[PDB]
Design a protein around this motif. Structure first.
Motif, PDB file in Angstrom:
ATOM      1  N   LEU A 196       0.860  -1.161   0.000  1.00  0.00           N
ATOM      2  CA  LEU A 196       0.000   0.000   0.000  1.00  0.00           C
ATOM      3  C   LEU A 196       0.905   1.221   0.000  1.00  0.00           C
ATOM      4  CD1 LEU A 196      -2.917   1.029   0.280  1.00  0.00           C
ATOM      5  CD2 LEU A 196      -2.518   1.009   2.749  1.00  0.00           C
ATOM      6  N   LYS A 197       0.603   2.166  -0.881  1.00  0.00           N
ATOM      7  CA  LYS A 197       1.370   3.385  -1.049  1.00  0.00           C
ATOM      8  C   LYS A 197       0.407   4.509  -1.382  1.00  0.00           C
ATOM      9  CE  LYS A 197       5.097   3.375  -3.244  1.00  0.00           C
ATOM     10  NZ  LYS A 197       6.012   3.534  -4.412  1.00  0.00           N
ATOM     11  N   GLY A 198       0.936   5.720  -1.414  1.00  0.00           N
ATOM     12  CA  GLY A 198       0.109   6.830  -1.823  1.00  0.00           C
ATOM     13  C   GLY A 198      -0.843   7.230  -0.712  1.00  0.00           C
ATOM     14  N   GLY A 199      -1.925   7.889  -1.107  1.00  0.00           N
ATOM     15  CA  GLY A 199      -2.833   8.458  -0.142  1.00  0.00           C
ATOM     16  C   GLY A 199      -2.090   9.392   0.786  1.00  0.00           C
ATOM     17  N   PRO A 200      -2.303   9.243   2.096  1.00  0.00           N
ATOM     18  CA  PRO A 200      -1.576  10.059   3.070  1.00  0.00           C
ATOM     19  C   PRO A 200      -0.193   9.525   3.381  1.00  0.00           C
ATOM     20  CG  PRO A 200      -2.941   8.500   4.231  1.00  0.00           C
ATOM     21  CD  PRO A 200      -3.177   8.249   2.751  1.00  0.00           C
ATOM     22  N   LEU A 201       0.197   8.414   2.770  1.00  0.00           N
ATOM     23  CA  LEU A 201       1.376   7.680   3.200  1.00  0.00           C
ATOM     24  C   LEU A 201       2.632   8.186   2.515  1.00  0.00           C
ATOM     25  CD1 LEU A 201      -0.105   4.105   2.995  1.00  0.00           C
ATOM     26  CD2 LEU A 201       0.038   5.578   5.028  1.00  0.00           C
ATOM     27  N   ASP A 202       3.719   8.199   3.269  1.00  0.00           N
ATOM     28  CA  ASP A 202       5.048   8.354   2.702  1.00  0.00           C
ATOM     29  C   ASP A 202       5.711   6.988   2.700  1.00  0.00           C
ATOM     30  OD1 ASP A 202       5.171  11.268   4.709  1.00  0.00           O
ATOM     31  OD2 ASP A 202       4.784  11.210   2.545  1.00  0.00           O
ATOM     32  N   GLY A 203       6.227   6.588   1.557  1.00  0.00           N
ATOM     33  CA  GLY A 203       6.922   5.330   1.468  1.00  0.00           C
ATOM     34  C   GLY A 203       5.982   4.172   1.202  1.00  0.00           C
ATOM     35  N   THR A 204       6.475   2.984   1.528  1.00  0.00           N
ATOM     36  CA  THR A 204       5.877   1.729   1.104  1.00  0.00           C
ATOM     37  C   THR A 204       5.503   0.918   2.328  1.00  0.00           C
ATOM     38  OG1 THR A 204       7.234   1.681  -0.899  1.00  0.00           O
ATOM     39  CG2 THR A 204       6.286  -0.415  -0.141  1.00  0.00           C
ATOM     40  N   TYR A 205       4.280   0.415   2.337  1.00  0.00           N
ATOM     41  CA  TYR A 205       3.770  -0.362   3.453  1.00  0.00           C
ATOM     42  C   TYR A 205       3.390  -1.742   2.943  1.00  0.00           C
ATOM     43  CZ  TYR A 205       3.324   3.903   6.311  1.00  0.00           C
ATOM     44  OH  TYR A 205       3.553   5.044   7.046  1.00  0.00           O
ATOM     45  N   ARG A 206       3.961  -2.773   3.549  1.00  0.00           N
ATOM     46  CA  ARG A 206       3.778  -4.141   3.092  1.00  0.00           C
ATOM     47  C   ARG A 206       2.611  -4.779   3.813  1.00  0.00           C
ATOM     48  NH1 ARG A 206       9.603  -6.921   3.498  1.00  0.00           N
ATOM     49  NH2 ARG A 206      10.556  -5.515   1.953  1.00  0.00           N
ATOM     50  N   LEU A 207       1.735  -5.422   3.052  1.00  0.00           N
ATOM     51  CA  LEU A 207       0.636  -6.166   3.642  1.00  0.00           C
ATOM     52  C   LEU A 207       1.184  -7.348   4.429  1.00  0.00           C
ATOM     53  CD1 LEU A 207      -2.428  -6.702   3.840  1.00  0.00           C
ATOM     54  CD2 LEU A 207      -2.141  -8.121   1.767  1.00  0.00           C
TER      55      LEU A 207
END
Ligand SMILES: CC(C)(C)C(=O)Nc1nnc(S(N)(=O)=O)s1
Ligand SMILES: [Zn+2]
Length: 257
Positions: free
Chosen positions: A76-87
């Motif tokens: 998951l990336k984008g939206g309010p997020l900085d960087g990369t988030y792994r499920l």
């Protein structure tokens, strides 16, 4: 040990987990008229095509569908997020009746259930480190209402008989979580916490506006799970949701006008 009963439920958690009364606890009520559209919010990037599910576990509080998070496979990336988030896993919270079960509420409305797709910020290397960070996790929350069946949920529903009781797990490979998403990725976002102990204040919450529909039969099968272990008195796994917590000094932002 903490749970969802009268003697160990959310109103008791603060005794072992004082952060339960903290400044950025989840879930919250999403007051749609008070949430502000933020035009600087980017569209969500949900990249689940390479997701590798592995196992499904009844942990005594919900069931987790776990993923291989040793590489950037489903992120998951984008939206309010900085960087990369792994499920890392998804799970649900659900009610004993269709009128309750979600953790977040929308203008005080409770949905029958809420799906949490949990992702950890890869800049922290492992989820255990990530949960110690204010931006360590991103949880994508999706409401479930009861109506038509969700075809992409059925494979989950049908394995639940094999993990009825706490501590049971089953192989659960090749499950595509894209089948659990609604059409729209419009969302609300706010900084919050895990909704279960240890209630760490490490979550960027991204709650989709569009619920998915699941059938009564699908949710009834959730309600046949057990909080207890095998060979113990049966306690149906229902109402495993924490109620809305004070918003305090937070603004919920909307990705959509
Ligand atoms: C991976 C790890 C940290 C064990 C996890 O995901 N724990 C959760 N505890 N509560 C969650 S919730 N209901 O806020 O999504 S996720
Ligand atoms: Zn959850």
């Amino acid at each position: 040990h903490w749970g969802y009963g009268k003697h160990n439920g959310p109103e008791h958690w603060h005794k072992d987990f004082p952060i339960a009364k903290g400044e950025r606890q989840s879930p919250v009520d999403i007051d749609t008229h008070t949430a502000k559209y933020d035009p600087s919010l980017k569209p969500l990037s949900v990249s689940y095509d390479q997701a590798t599910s592995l196992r499904i576990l009844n942990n005594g509080h919900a069931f987790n569908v776990e993923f291989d998070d040793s590489q950037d496979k489903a992120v998951l990336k984008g939206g309010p997020l900085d960087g990369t988030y792994r499920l890392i896993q998804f799970h649900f919270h659900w009610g004993s009746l269709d009128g309750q079960g979600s953790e977040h509420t929308v203008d005080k409305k409770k949905y029958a259930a809420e799906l949490h797709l949990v992702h950890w910020n890869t800049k922290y290397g492992d989820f255990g480190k990530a949960v110690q960070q204010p931006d360590g996790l991103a949880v994508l929350g999706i409401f479930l209402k009861v109506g038509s069946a969700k075809p992409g949920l059925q494979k989950v529903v049908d394995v639940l008989d094999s993990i009825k009781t706490k501590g049971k797990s089953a192989d659960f490979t090749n499950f595509d979580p894209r089948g659990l998403l609604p059409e729209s990725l419009d969302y609300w976002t706010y900084p919050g916490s895990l909704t279960t102990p240890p209630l760490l204040e490490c979550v960027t919450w991204i709650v989709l506006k569009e619920p998915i529909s699941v059938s009564s039969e699908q949710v009834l099968k959730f309600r046949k799970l057990n909080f207890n272990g095998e060979g113990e008195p049966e306690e149906l796994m229902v109402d495993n949701w924490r109620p809305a917590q004070p918003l305090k000094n937070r603004q919920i932002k909307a990705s959509f006008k």
